[PDB]
Amino acid sequence: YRYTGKLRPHYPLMPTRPVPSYIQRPDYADHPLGMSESEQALKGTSQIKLLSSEDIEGMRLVCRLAREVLDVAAGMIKPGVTTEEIDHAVHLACIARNCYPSPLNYYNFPKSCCTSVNEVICHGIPDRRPLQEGDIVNVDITLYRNGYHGDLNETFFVGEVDDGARKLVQTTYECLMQAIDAVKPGVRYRELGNIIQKHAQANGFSVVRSYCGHGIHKLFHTAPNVPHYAKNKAVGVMKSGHVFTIEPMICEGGWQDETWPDGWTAVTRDGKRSAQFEHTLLVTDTGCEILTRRLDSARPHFMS
């Protein structure tokens, strides 16, 4: 395998981290290949769940807890800290909140969160690599509590970063927020990609095509599929009670991705940097509720 940039995996990985048995587990947690039978039963269906009041309360809770866990990771971002060390702290923070870390054993994914440095678009596997001054790193968190999953991510700066990194991260965040601002009942899911690509393109960046936002509730990933690029064929119209993510991945160079031999790490084919931000959203009569928002601070971590 020819690596596309400077990043390499840093092995060995620590043995899988156990989750105490008192924490409620999703179906895939104990499947030998980490398959989710509840999800697979709906594979190829485009119908979107309308959440009940109980569902909404469940989503508010797990999304708030997921935010707390992302904030834990954010506080650890500094030169010399390994992504494995971030993952260990995330794992413990989930357990402390009586939550299962959703990525863990999801289709045999080996860790409790995804850490995506520089040219890694998404699904980076926490490993022994110390973060370096100038790096950008995304941490993508998902928690499972009482049958519900809550999902968010932010890109962080490691020490002082260059102008390109600042512009990339800022633009990606703006892309997410412009998309969120358009969410309300009656809007087609396919419209969000038009909004995101317009803003990315205006700043000389490209939009990843192979990975999309998704419905999330009792399932980790389900209908609708939410592409982030323009003129896509996403099926569905937003209705009050829909819960889904928007999670644009934006690139300095071209949009093309490839996967490392580990089967997970998605990287830019040109080795240039990529950034991502993500919220879980509930559609309401007036627009949407950002379930994974900060409650105590106005801005994402890269601005604070």
Ligand X SMILES: Cc1nc(-c2ccccn2)nc(N[C@H](Cc2ccccc2)C(N)=O)c1Cl
Q: How far is the CB of 148 from Co ion (least distance, A)?
A: 14
Residues forming a β-bridge with 143: 101, 150
Q: How far is the CB of 285 from ligand X (least distance, A)?
A: 28
Q: Which does 109 bind (CB under 5 to 8 A by kind): Co ion, K ion, ligand X, none?
A: ligand X
39 makes contact with Co ion (CB under 5 A): no
* Sign for the pseudo-dihedral over CA of 212, 40, 53, 141: negative
268 makes contact with K ion (CB under 5 A): no
Contact pattern from residue 225 through residue 264 relative to Co ion, giving x for each residue in contact according to CB under 5 A and a dash for the rest: --------------------x-x-----------------
Q: How far is the CB of 54 from ligand X (least distance, A)?
A: 25
For residues 85-124, which are near ligand X according to CB under 6 A?
Answer: 103, 106-107, 109, 114, 123
260 makes contact with ligand X (CB under 6 A): no
Task: Give the DSSP letter string of the chain.
Answer: ---SSS----PPPPP-----TTS---GGGGSTT---HHHHTTTT--------HHHHHHHHHHHHHHHHHHHHHHTT-STT-BHHHHHHHHHHHHHHTT-EETTTTGGG--SSSEEEETTEEE-PPP-SPBP-TT-EEEEEEEEEETTEEEEEEEEEE-SS--HHHHHHHHHHHHHHHHHHHT-STT-BTTHHHHHHHHHHHHTT-EE-SS--EEE-SSSSSEEEEE--STT-----B--TT-EEEE--EEESS---EEE-TTS--EEETT---EEE-BEEEEEETTEEEETT--SS-SS-GGG-
CB 142 within 8 A of CB 102: yes
193 makes contact with ligand X (CB under 6 A): no
Q: How far is the CB of 36 from ligand X (least distance, A)?
A: 7
- Was 10 annotated as part of a binding site? no
Q: How far is the CB of 245 from K ion (least distance, A)?
A: 17
151 makes contact with Co ion (CB under 5 A): yes
Selected binder of K ion within 112, 142, 274, 280 (CB under 5 A): 274
The size of the interface with ligand X (CB under 6 A), counted in residues, is 10
- Was 162 annotated as part of a binding site? no
Q: Which does 197 bind (CB under 5 to 8 A by kind): K ion, ligand X, Co ion, none?
A: none
171 makes contact with K ion (CB under 5 A): no
For residues 276-295, which are near Co ion according to CB under 5 A?
Answer: 278
Q: What is the C-alpha R_g of the chain?
A: 18
Binding site feature residues: 123, 140, 151, 214, 221, 247, 278
Summarize as ranges the residues that interact with ligand X (CB under 6 A). 39, 103, 106-107, 109, 114, 123, 211, 214, 221
Summarize as ranges the residues that interact with Co ion (CB under 5 A). 140, 151, 153, 245, 247, 278
Binding site feature residues for a protein: 123, 221
